[PDB]
Design a binder for these strands. Structure first.
Ligand SMILES: [Mg+2]
Ligand SMILES: [Mg+2]
Ligand SMILES: [Mg+2]
Ligand SMILES: [Mg+2]
Ligand SMILES: [Mg+2]
Lengths: 85, 199, 143, 129, 76
RNA sequence: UGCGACAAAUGCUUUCCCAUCUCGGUGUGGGGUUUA
RNA sequence: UGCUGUUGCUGUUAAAGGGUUCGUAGUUGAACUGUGGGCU
């Protein structure tokens, strides 16, 4: 579904780079500052259940110092983090 | 009969069942009410139309009157509106002035001579002001969704939410029956800083 | 004052409200408002000054929102408009006082420079008023 | 002074997209500007937007998804016949597979792909991709 | 923080600090007061207001009310 | 000159100074509207 | 030969912003009168 298809129906793309969740830009092969973070899911009893959720952050966002702010917004959207009191 | 004088001379012949009922009420009030007794003698209506709002119990009575009496009606609109409701239980009354619209010309030279108060933009705005008269508009926005539709929202002051809240469903439907345009309402506490109020 | 003829970039001005309906507590009929406007004109006030008297001491924020017409329109209907427009009148008065000062102080070169700017402003303004027929043709400014 | 309202608005949107903002405010508004936005909205390049009334030239707040690369105006508004479409596509578009040129025609405001199907010419307003 | 700022619905804290012509929709800053015969006085009056004596003094900003007469802000 | 009929985008049962002297309807037992 | 540049050049230091203003032809110039509706 993602990529370039010729009229013959085959996919003719070498690979599909990651698309950032915060900036919506493509993460290139020579970024070296882009990272992935895994946050564990904890069961009702209070221990981890063996599953995690993964986030990706483009390199330039970490250069401007806005990477921390982007993480806060994403976690709230996923319900990982609460707000107010 | 004297009460037929409250109608336009054309309709004095064979009035409809709604027309004379309003005429009797207007004639009776012109001699009884303290504040209406010096405005009513010069007043007469054009026609009365009945509208049934779907998914509702109350019905809406629309009264048309000539544009001459715009200032006359605005002076006593509050008392006149409430007085008519009592005589007609289970109904809502709105007073609307009858205005005409000149269609938008195609030629540039003709467009310069159009009387601006007869454009559809100006007329539809005044019709809305008639239906909510004791209240006024404090803001207006247009919402353009991705599907291509455009929805218009009108903000009223929150100070008079209690009075006019029950009537907004009727006003929205009647406004569509007269202009074929969609409207939606909201309330603003402190309209100066554009603060909307949720409940 | 700000942009034309100078480097000023000020922004000070008034901001009219979105709601154009007079308040409930204002109980003056439109006929009486028109009477007060015409009365102040015969006393000798200009349209700018008339609107400030009503604003300051009568509670009338905008004459148009009460009567439907602007102040200068009211004076024109009653035959009380000034012979020449108000802003052109004040610019001509300023240039006359500058010239009287300069005929004694002939070395005040800063004032001479300011006189050039004011007279250029007068000629631009006169050209506009002649095009819209608020001034007679062949009206001329005399130094 | 400000000579072109359309040119001012499009430059504001492109700048916000380059910096990665989520919303942008535009002033002054115009009926030509609104028509241009609806063309971009129809092809999915911008999200929902909203018009605020202030008894003057209004303001617009538009929501941006990350899909827009650049938009801009063409000044002066050159005339384009039906045979000139390939010339303009070749000059100001990244490729022949995506991107649009917006025109004003006697049939309304539309992108170059729709105008060709209707067999009409007009004047060039801008582009986006 | 943690609150997303919508451009079309600014918070009261943010909008309250803006210049009158930098708001989302511009508006006035002044108002009317009545004093006590009873007369109405503009908050930024610059001319002379008489009762029988002057009631306010002009100032670079808001007018200065004389001492010895009650005043009240009028609504709307 | 009189006459009949109908409109009116702005009230001639006008303006102007001349003078002379508790109930009902409504929404949820309470609220808000007109009136007393 | 994008070293004559409409498409499409350069002007802080390489060649190149007039000492500063006013100003007539000329070029350029803000918003607005406009969402048709109902049926299967
Ligand atoms: Mg070549
Ligand atoms: Mg070179
Ligand atoms: Mg050099
Ligand atoms: Mg220099
Ligand atoms: Mg224009």
């Amino acid at each position: 579904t993602i990529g370039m298809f010729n009229e013959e129906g085959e996919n003719v793309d070498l690979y599909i780079p990651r698309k950032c969740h915060a900036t919506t830009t493509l993460i290139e092969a020579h970024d070296h500052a882009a990272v992935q973070i895994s946050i564990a899911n904890v069961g009702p009893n209070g221990v981890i259940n063996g599953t995690t959720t993964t986030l990706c952050i483009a390199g330039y966002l970490r250069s401007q110092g806005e990477s921390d702010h982007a993480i806060n917004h994403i976690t709230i959207d996923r319900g990982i983090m609460r707000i107010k009191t | 009969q004297p009460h037929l004088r409250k109608l336009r001379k054309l309709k004095r012949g064979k009035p409809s069942d709604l027309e004379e009922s309003v005429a009797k009420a207007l004639f009776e009030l012109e001699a009884s009410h303290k504040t209406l007794r010096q405005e009513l003698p010069r007043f007469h209506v054009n026609t009365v139309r009945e509208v049934k709002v779907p998914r509702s119990k109350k019905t809406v009575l629309v009264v048309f009157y000539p544009l001459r009496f715009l200032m006359l009606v605005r002076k006593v609109q509050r008392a006149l509106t409430s007085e008519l409701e009592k005589r007609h239980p289970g109904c809502l009354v709105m007073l609307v002035a009858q205005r005409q619209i000149t269609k938008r010309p195609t030629d540039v030279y003709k467009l310069q001579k159009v009387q601006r108060s007869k454009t559809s933009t100006a007329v539809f705005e005044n019709i809305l002001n008639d239906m909510i008269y004791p209240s006024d508009v404090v803001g207006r926005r247009w919402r353009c969704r991705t599907d291509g539709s455009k929805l218009m929202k009108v903000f009223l002051d929150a100070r008079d939410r209690k009075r006019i809240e029950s009537r907004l469903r009727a006003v929205a439907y009647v406004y569509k029956q007269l202009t074929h345009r969609r409207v939606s309402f909201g309330f603003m506490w402190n309209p100066k800083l554009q603060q909307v109020s949720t409940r | 004052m700000v942009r034309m003829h100078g480097n000023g970039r000020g922004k000070a001005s008034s901001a009219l409200p979105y709601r154009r309906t007079p308040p409930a507590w204002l109980k003056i009929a439109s006929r009486n408002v028109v009477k007060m406007v015409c009365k102040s004109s015969r006393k000798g006030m200009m349209p700018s000054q008339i609107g400030m008297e009503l604003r300051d001491s009568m509670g009338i924020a905008q004459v148009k929102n009460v009567t439907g017409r602007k102040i200068l329109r009211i004076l024109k209907h009653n035959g009380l408009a000034p012979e020449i427009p108000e802003d052109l009148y004040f610019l001509v008065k300023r240039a006359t006082q500058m010239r009287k000062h300069l005929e004694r102080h002939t070395t005040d070169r800063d004032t001479k420079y300011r006189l050039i700017l004011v007279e250029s402003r007068i000629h631009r303004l006169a050209r506009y008023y002649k095009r819209v027929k608020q001034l007679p043709p062949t009206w001329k400014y005399e130094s | 002074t400000m000579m072109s309202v359309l040119a001012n608005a499009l430059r504001t949107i492109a700048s916000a997209e380059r910096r990665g903002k989520r919303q942008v405010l535009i002033r002054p508004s115009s009926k030509v500007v609104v028509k241009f936005l609806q063309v971009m909205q129809k092809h999915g390049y911008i999200g929902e937007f909203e018009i605020i009334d202030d008894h003057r030239a209004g303001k617009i707040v538009v929501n941006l998804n990350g899909r827009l690369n650049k938009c801009g105006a063409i000044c002066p508004r050159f005339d384009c016949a039906t045979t000139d479409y390939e010339k303009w596509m070749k000059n100001i578009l990244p490729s022949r597979q995506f991107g649009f040129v917006v025109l004003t025609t006697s049939l309304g405001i539309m992108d170059h792909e729709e105008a060709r199907s209707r067999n009409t010419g007009g004047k060039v307003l801008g582009f986006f991709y | 923080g943690f609150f997303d700022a919508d451009l079309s619905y600014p918070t009261v804290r943010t909008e309250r600090m803006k210049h009158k012509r930098r708001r989302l929709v511009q508006g006035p800053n002044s108002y009317f007061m009545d004093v006590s015969q009873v007369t109405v006085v503009y908050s930024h009056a610059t001319t002379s207001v008489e009762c029988s004596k002057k009631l306010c003094r002009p100032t670079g900003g808001k007018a200065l009310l004389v001492e010895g007469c009650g005043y009240r802000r009028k609504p709307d």
